[PDB]
């Protein structure tokens, strides 16, 4: 808001946004998030219904992981 006002001051509504965006320094997305994101494997029950092969919910030993 500050820089939009100051840019309107000298009088050098779309390109104004692209000017302000580049002219200013802001906090990036990461330092304003507060949530975490995880993935839940593909269930075998669901993969056997729509006819798909679930590589994810298949368990594995420690030797088999190459």
């Amino acid at each position: 808001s500050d820089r939009t006002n100051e840019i309107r001051s000298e009088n050098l509504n779309d390109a104004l946004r692209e000017v302000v965006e580049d002219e200013t320094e802001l906090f990036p997305p990461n330092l304003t998030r507060r949530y975490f994101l995880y993935f839940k494997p593909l269930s075998q029950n669901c993969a056997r219904r729509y006819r798909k092969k679930a590589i994810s919910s298949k368990p594995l030993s420690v030797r088999q992981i190459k």
Partner: peptide
Amino acid sequence: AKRISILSRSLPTFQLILNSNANQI
């Protein structure tokens, strides 16, 4: 000039050329 181009629509450093009318050694 950066603002002027963006609002009036790869810019190198601009050259300053000085012209004067004063004492001459």
